[PDB]
Design a binder for this molecule. Structure first.
Ligand SMILES: CC(C)S[C@@H]1O[C@H](CO)[C@H](O)[C@H](O)[C@H]1O
Length: 335
């Protein structure tokens, strides 16, 4: 009786959701997923720490038993999959950068290890995962060259980013390859992301897309997001995915006032925020091809623990699978 998000936006972009693997054996989760979403991301199950293993010898092997379940589900229900993520400073074990004795690998050895990782993961899902977050969160505006000093930078160096895109494009030449980041609409970080992606495109690096995470709060200025998308879309042939959208009911990451249940006026403010947001996304439908929400429903949200244990209601569906005020205001950005 209520309308399907994917159908309402069928002319505009894919509507996606980030999922932990347990949802596939919960009939009520499966009902909400298949009604509303034609795209899915693994919330954690395709990150390097979720696939990388060592045996007793210290030899590296890959466990795809959980990741394969996402492709199986997607094929059964006619959904596309965003692969998240190949190269990241986070959720990657420290031993991946080291030999049997805990010394840093040589640049040559780590380039080889990166190549094998990307060829194995992207190669296994060739033709089945239409888009990859190849590199995640490489930008740090506090550094002279604007690049985070992770183990990737320390062990390989600043070309680790373009090498990751090269290897992913070799493993699946048909995949759309994304650079993904957060605070992507803050002016200093936005300008560094623009410059990184534009320069890589100009020297023929196979990057096809910017992933804008859109981890937002009610304090955020949607005007800044409009401006960021205007800047990014001036890069010839780039498309944009909104990769991890959520809207915290809080106005910072450490609120002094925490809600047990959300005030009506706070759900209404969130509904108006999501309305303005989807107006800006539709305005940029020429460049935006996928909008993915970081969680199926409010009680599954990472925002209930990652910044401290608290209730938050950041999504379009509540704890009882029911549409929120924001659901209706998002639908009405079209209807
Ligand atoms: C899907 C999430 C884990 S991405 C998330 O972005 C955040 C920004 O608020 C953090 O800085 C973390 O680096 C990252 O885990």
């Amino acid at each position: 009786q209520i309308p399907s998000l994917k159908d309402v936006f069928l002319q505009d972009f894919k509507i996606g959701v980030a999922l932990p693997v347990r949802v596939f054996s919960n009939s009520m989760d499966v009902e909400l997923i298949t009604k509303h979403f034609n795209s899915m991301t693994a919330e954690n199950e395709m990150k390097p720490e979720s696939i990388l293993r060592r045996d007793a010898s210290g030899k590296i092997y890959y466990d795809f038993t959980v990741a394969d379940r996402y492709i199986e589900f997607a094929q059964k229900h006619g959904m596309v999959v965003r692969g998240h993520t190949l190269v990241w400073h986070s959720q990657t074990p420290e031993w991946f950068f080291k030999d049997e004795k805990g010394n840093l690998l040589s640049r040559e050895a780590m380039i080889e290890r990166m190549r094998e990782y990307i060829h194995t993961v992207v190669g296994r899902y060739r033709g089945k995962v239409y888009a990859w977050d190849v590199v995640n969160e490489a930008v740090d505006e506090n550094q002279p060259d604007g690049l985070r000093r992770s183990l990737w930078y320390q062990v390989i160096g600043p070309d680790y980013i373009e090498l990751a895109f090269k290897f992913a494009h070799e493993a699946d030449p048909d995949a759309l390859l994304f650079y993904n980041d957060y605070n992507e609409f803050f002016p200093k970080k936005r300008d560094i992301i623009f410059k990184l992606v534009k320069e890589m495109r100009e020297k023929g690096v196979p990057i096809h897309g910017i992933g804008m995470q859109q981890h937002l709060t009610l304090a955020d200025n949607v005007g800044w997001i409009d401006i960021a998308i205007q800047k990014f879309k001036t890069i010839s042939g780039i498309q944009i995915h909104i990769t991890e959208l959520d809207v915290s009911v809080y106005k910072s990451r450490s609120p002094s006032i925490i809600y047990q249940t959300p005030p009506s006026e706070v759900l209404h403010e969130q509904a108006e925020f999501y309305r303005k947001l989807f107006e800006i996304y539709r305005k940029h439908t020429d460049v935006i091809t996928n909008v993915t929400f970081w969680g199926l429903k409010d009680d599954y949200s990472w925002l209930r623990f990652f910044f401290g244990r608290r209730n938050d209601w950041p999504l379009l569906f509540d704890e009882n699978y029911q549409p929120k005020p924001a659901f209706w205001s998002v639908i009405e950005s079209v209807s």
